[PDB]
């Protein structure tokens, strides 16, 4: 993944952030395969960045799940003149049982952050925050209501810096939740 593709990303994705589900519908010469290629390359790049041995995001996995992907294109002009992709965030609701600090196992179904990646060359340029904000607004969720699949320390620092989130009770299911997640807790 270099951000650029051998087709016109701006023609494919007219909007700054494009939201796709399992159907991978092109916005309105196989435009759907253009989208699938972008997702495949994004997933491979994200896995590499997270020290994972294989991708957790791909076109095929989008098609066989009920996840939603938000894709941020580059709003600047590139020298190659066909646009570019900055990164993405993938979310999905999941059933979990989470332990609180009162020894209760709570059955929940939160929106989960499942994959999140911004191209290395343009990390720490604010793109991740922009993408995350757009997702919060469309999904109608507040940050402390999220669970995150095995977050990187980079993401925990991002969430603490931008939203003051602090992790709460550690779990055995590989998801992380934050203070405010439980009904008896308060967001920061």
């Amino acid at each position: 993944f270099t951000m650029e593709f051998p087709f016109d990303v701006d023609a494919l994705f007219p909007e700054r952030i494009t939201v796709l589900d399992q159907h991978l519908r092109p916005p309105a010469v196989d435009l759907q395969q253009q989208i699938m290629t972008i997702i495949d390359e994004l997933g491979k790049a994200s896995a590499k960045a997270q020290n994972l041995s294989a991708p957790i995001t791909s076109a095929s996995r989008m098609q066989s799940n009920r996840h939603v992907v938000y894709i941020l294109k580059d709003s600047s002009a590139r020298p190659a003149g066909k646009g570019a992709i900055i990164g993405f965030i993938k979310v999905g609701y999941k059933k979990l049982f989470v332990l609180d600090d009162r020894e209760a196992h709570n059955e929940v179904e939160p929106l989960c952050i499942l994959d999140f990646y911004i191209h290395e060359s343009v990390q720490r340029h604010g793109h991740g925050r922009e993408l995350f904000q757009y997702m919060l607004q469309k999904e109608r969720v507040e940050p402390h209501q999220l669970a995150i699949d095995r977050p990187s320390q980079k993401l925990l620092k991002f969430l603490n810096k931008h939203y003051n989130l602090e992790t709460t009770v550690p779990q055995v299911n590989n998801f992380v939740i934050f203070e405010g997640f439980f009904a008896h807790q308060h967001p920061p």
Binding site: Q50, L52, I56, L114, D149, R150, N173, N174, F175
Partner: peptide
């Protein structure tokens, strides 16, 4: 979790 898929990150396992």
């Amino acid at each position: 979790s898929d990150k396992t």
